[PDB]
Amino acid sequence: SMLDDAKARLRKYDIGGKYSHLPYNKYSVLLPLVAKEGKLHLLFTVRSEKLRRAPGEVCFPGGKRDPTDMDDAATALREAQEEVGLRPHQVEVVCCLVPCLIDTDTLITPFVGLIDHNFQAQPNPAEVKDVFLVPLAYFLHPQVHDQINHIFEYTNPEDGVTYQIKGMTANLAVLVAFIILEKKPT
Ligand SMILES: COc1ccc(-c2ccccc2N2CCCC2=O)cc1
């Protein structure tokens, strides 16, 4: 099926816990995959202004590891719950993609999660200003703007609202789209 096929593709790129023990300042992000209307979508947040890191920006759910977390996947799930109300029975973590090195002392670990069809986001306004979906296929033919550095613009056909997706977030979106959608019969 569609979801079984996504999982089987994603498992081929799982690095596991290989880089998880190194002595960095550690953050995790959840890349949440949602099936709607026969197709896969990624869920994004718009971060609240009040926040420490990346205020006002489009980002995946995520944040800083704390002493309660059993492992880096636990950080990603804890933070997704706090930001959009995603509960643990509502997500299956399928793999750990290549981590992102930043600022010489920081490592950000991305996890891909399949989201239950009955989940509905409850934006926590202390953390998140907005939550939106983008079809995964968009990232194969995005609308690109140069600010030189590349920025995607996505307009939601439901309401005409435009979002700007850039940086690590845009890079990880393209990666997931390639893994799942490359070389597919129609
Ligand atoms: C919601 O999850 C987050 C958000 C931000 C970060 C983060 C941490 C340290 C240095 C840079 C970081 N990023 C990554 C994108 C832009 C930005 O500021 C990690 C996890």
UniProtKB/Swiss-Prot annotation:
Expressed in liver, kidney, pancreas, pituitary, small intestine, spleen, heart and placenta. Weakly expressed in brain. Its main location: other. GO terms for molecular function: coenzyme A diphosphatase activity; magnesium ion binding; manganese ion binding; snoRNA binding. Belongs to the Nudix hydrolase family. PCD1 subfamily. It comes from Homo sapiens. GO terms for biological process: acetyl-CoA catabolic process; brown fat cell differentiation; butyryl-CoA catabolic process; coenzyme A catabolic process; malonyl-CoA catabolic process; medium-chain fatty-acyl-CoA catabolic process; nucleoside diphosphate metabolic process; propionyl-CoA catabolic process. Fatty acyl-coenzyme A (CoA) diphosphatase that hydrolyzes fatty acyl-CoA to yield acyl-4'-phosphopantetheine and adenosine 3',5'-bisphosphate. Cleaves CoA, CoA esters and oxidized CoA with similar efficiencies. Preferentially hydrolyzes medium-chain acyl-CoAs and bile acid-CoAs. Has no activity toward NDP-sugars, CDP-alcohols, (deoxy)nucleoside 5'-triphosphates, nucleoside 5'-di or monophosphates, diadenosine polyphosphates, NAD, NADH, NADP, NADPH or thymidine-5'-monophospho-p-nitrophenyl ester. The keyword Manganese applies. Residues 24-149 form the Nudix hydrolase domain. Its EC number is 3.6.1.-, 3.6.1.77. It is found in: Peroxisome. Inhibited by fluoride. It catalyses: hexanoyl-CoA + H2O = hexanoyl-4'-phosphopantetheine + adenosine 3',5'-bisphosphate + 2 H(+); octanoyl-CoA + H2O = S-octanoyl-4'-phosphopantetheine + adenosine 3',5'-bisphosphate + 2 H(+); butanoyl-CoA + H2O = S-butanoyl-4'-phosphopantetheine + adenosine 3',5'-bisphosphate + 2 H(+); decanoyl-CoA + H2O = decanoyl-4'-phosphopantetheine + adenosine 3',5'-bisphosphate + 2 H(+). It is an enzyme of class 3 (hydrolase). This is Peroxisomal coenzyme A diphosphatase NUDT7. GO terms for cellular component: cytosol; peroxisomal matrix; peroxisome. The record marks 53 as: Important for coenzyme A binding. Monomer. Keywords: Hydrolase, Magnesium, Manganese, Metal-binding, Peroxisome, RNA-binding. The modification N6-succinyllysine is found at residue 7. Mg(2+) binds at residues 79, 83. A motif (Nudix box) lies at residues 64-85.
